[PDB]
């Protein structure tokens, strides 16, 4: 696979849950550690509706959909697909969120390293109208027969940006805070019934969870879900903004976040109008950090930038200077010692404390823009 493998030793097991089977159900993609470590057969963009939403996010023609889905429509990620649960532990949960135009299988690298280190990592599949598709069913019959009702990104009027955008950010805070009550719900033994009708047993998941020990991580408009969601829901007891975008966020939340947060930026996405946003969530007494990964652009948290070669991930903008795999292990450690230091982790991740504060040839501390 050209998206790497996971760097912790336990193995790792994916699988989807969607319950329920509405558009204001649940939509998840799970990444845990396994038992059984088979094969890496996980299937990334899983269907043509991905492609052609993809297509219309990026602005172009009928065919660029069709030509993505040729390209990366049997590229898989490496994870155990429905593989078993690995019994007698209690694992920390991440909830993940999605940046615009993408949607829950785009992050499989950061989730597969976060489960190959022990977490459970709940990758939501947000239905605000962000996500270049995503699907629901209109009723039992249809789940029944996988007929899908797929909804496509909503393109908005620069007139409608500052509200659409602020609703938006409101939705995705109440589906991390639905996503986490529906997996607290299933650790303490609820019936579920997944609306997908896949091999893995839910109720694998019984008193499978540390209830203490929840976190939510996010890319760019899952950056700012991130901070919506820590105000809104005391669950979750840190979170990491991976390159947010603040544009959604209401002036009144920067001062309402009690709990410690992580700013991991690229190099290449910030500006003056975003960072000023971002130390306005600053305050001597709530704890704040900010890190920048040098030479690297917005796509260095997603998987696209696997997806390609150099030259053209290099041209697209899916690549920056610093290298790939690089980038993601400096985000992903730094984001392990900052888990392992505001959750109370039992693990030896605080050999990357050093990270958290800017110390390796590739981190700029905070940021290289001033305000």
Known sequence: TKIPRGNGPYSVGCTDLMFDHTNKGTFLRLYYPSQDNDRLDTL????????????KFLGTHWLMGNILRLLFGSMTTPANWNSPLRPGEKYPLVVFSHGLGAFRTLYSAIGIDLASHGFIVAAVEHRDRSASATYYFKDQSAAEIGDKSWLYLRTLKQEEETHIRN???????????????????????????????????MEQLKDSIDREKIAVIGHSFGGA?????LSEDQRFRCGIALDAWMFPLGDEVYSRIPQPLFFINSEYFQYPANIIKMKKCYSPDKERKMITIRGSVHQNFADFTFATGKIIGHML??????????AIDLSNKASLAFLQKHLGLHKDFDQWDCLIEGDDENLIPGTNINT
């Not at 990334?44 to 297509?55: A, R, V």
């Not at 879900?225 to 969601?229: A, D, E, L």
């Open 225 to 229: 879900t991130v901070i919506q969601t």
């Open 44 to 55: 990334w963009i899983p269907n043509k509706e991905y492609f052609w939403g993809l297509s």
């Open 317 to 326: 903008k899916l690549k920056g200077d610093i290298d790939s795999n690089v």
């Open 167 to 201: 609703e938006q950010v409101r939705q995705r805070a109440k589906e991390c805070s639905q996503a986490l009550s529906l997996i607290l719900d299933i650790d303490h033994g609820k019936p579920v019934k997944n609306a997908l009708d896949l091999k893995f047993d």
